[PDB]
Amino acid sequence: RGCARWCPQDSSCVNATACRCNPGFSSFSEIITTPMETCDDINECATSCGKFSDCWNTEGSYDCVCSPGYEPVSGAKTFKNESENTCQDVDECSSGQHQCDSSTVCFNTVGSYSCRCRPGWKPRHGIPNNQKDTVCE
Ligand SMILES: C[As](C)(=O)[O-]
Ligand SMILES: [Ba+2]
Ligand SMILES: [Ba+2]
């Protein structure tokens, strides 16, 4: 029809005297009729991203991301639903991404990894075996 100039932040005119929140935002009424009304971000993460992932809420949207220790097989850094989820555990030992001390051997775990002595070396004082910072002698 026409276009109200006074639409509040995150809403768009639907005609000369009314607005509607943009996708991803909500207001008390389905149709906004005054500039005092507000369009608040909807937290999609509190309403499924699938395995090994986290949901991060944003303004007007949200993103699923593989959790730390996992990475998408498909390469996509962000996704929207379980159907697009390609997160798999990162094998830090095979990939050489681990930061183990030359005195230990990397041992892959799901979501993480650790470093162990060689089971003839022994851990230096104050540091347990089977940790990322393990150092032996
Ligand atoms: C693997 As999840 C989306 O429950 O943090
Ligand atoms: Ba949002
Ligand atoms: Ba792992």
Curated annotation (Swiss-Prot):
Glycan-carrying positions: N15, N81
Superkingdom, natural source: Eukaryota
EGF-like domain span: 1-40, 41-88, 89-137
Disulphide bonds in the chain: C3-C13, C7-C19, C21-C39, C45-C55, C49-C64, C66-C87, C93-C106, C100-C115, C117-C136
Annotated tissue distribution: Expression is restricted to myeloid cells. Highest expression was found in peripheral blood leukocytes, followed by spleen and lymph nodes, with intermediate to low levels in thymus, bone marrow, fetal liver, placenta, and lung, and no expression in heart, brain, skeletal muscle, kidney, or pancreas. Expression is also detected in monocyte/macrophage and Jurkat cell lines but not in other cell lines tested. High expression in mast cells.
Coiled coil: none
Record PTM: Autoproteolytically cleaved into 2 subunits, an extracellular alpha subunit and a seven-transmembrane beta subunit.
Assembly with partners or alone: Forms a heterodimer, consisting of a large extracellular region non-covalently linked to a seven-transmembrane moiety. Interacts with chondroitin sulfate; the interaction with chondroitin sulfate is calcium-dependent. Interacts with CD55.
Its biological purpose: Cell surface receptor that binds to the chondroitin sulfate moiety of glycosaminoglycan chains and promotes cell attachment. Promotes granulocyte chemotaxis, degranulation and adhesion. In macrophages, promotes the release of inflammatory cytokines, including IL8 and TNF. Signals probably through G-proteins. Is a regulator of mast cell degranulation.
Protein family (similarity comment): Belongs to the G-protein coupled receptor 2 family. Adhesion G-protein coupled receptor (ADGR) subfamily.
Name of the protein this chain belongs to: Adhesion G protein-coupled receptor E2
Source organism: Homo sapiens (Human)
Lineage, highest ranks first: Eukaryota, Metazoa, Chordata, Craniata, Vertebrata
Gene this chain is encoded by: ADGRE2
Entire-sequence positions represented here: 27 to 260 of 823
